[PDB]
Every structure is written in C-alpha cells, then in structure tokens.
Amino acid sequence: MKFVYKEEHPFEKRRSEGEKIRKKYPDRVPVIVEKAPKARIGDLDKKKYLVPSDLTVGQFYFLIRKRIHLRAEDALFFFVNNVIPPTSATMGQLYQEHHEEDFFLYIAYSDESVYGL
C-alpha cells in the first residue's frame, strides 16, 4: 500500500527519526496515518502521531473519527499491510507486530472495509 510519507521521506532518514522518537518518548508509539486512495471521506490535518501504547485500536477509531469530523453515517476502517487490525488490539501490540525497519507503524484509513475502494 503506497504511502506519501514513504514516497517523500528517504528510508534512512525515516529510520533515524523513528529511533530517536522511540528513545525520547518510549511509552508512546510513532504512527503514520494517511487516507486510503479512493476513500471518499475527510483528509487528515497531520499524519504523524505519537500514540499511547495502551490505547486500543477501538479507542483510536474514536480519536481519528473526531479529527476528520466524520458524519455519523460515515464509516471508518483501518488497514495495516492491507489487512484490518481488530478493534481489540492495543496500538502497542499493533506496533510490535507491524512496525517497519524504520521504527514506524503505518496505518491507512478508509470508508470502505476493503483497501482501497
């Protein structure tokens, strides 16, 4: 799944930054969040987030929802590696399993239950 952030920030610079930020704010997890191609819903203000390790995916839905001012009837789905993480994982667990060699975790969101329609 293409990411703009990866496209325009060189790996080794993503890696030094991710290492620093883990070392500097350890009880939070660094997350890149970008709208899925062809998602019809709101675009996000910023894309770099430092998230409490013990926040649930579920709870993170509410926070992101509120940041893009979704309509009640709008849907929101998350995608890590083309796959939905279950609401019942922590962001910390998601980070452990799914972070990349640059120390970031990458999440795309959509109004479709499939990336990326």
Binding site: P30, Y49, L50, L55
Partner: peptide, 12 residues
C-alpha cells in the same frame, strides 16, 4: 500537543 513534528495523541 504537537512537538517534534508529532501530534501527541491523548486519551482525550
């Protein structure tokens, strides 16, 4: 809230 280029996401 926003330091080091990251939104410090709080429980809220």
């Amino acid at each position: 809230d926003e330091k080091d280029g990251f939104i410090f996401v709080n429980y809220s």
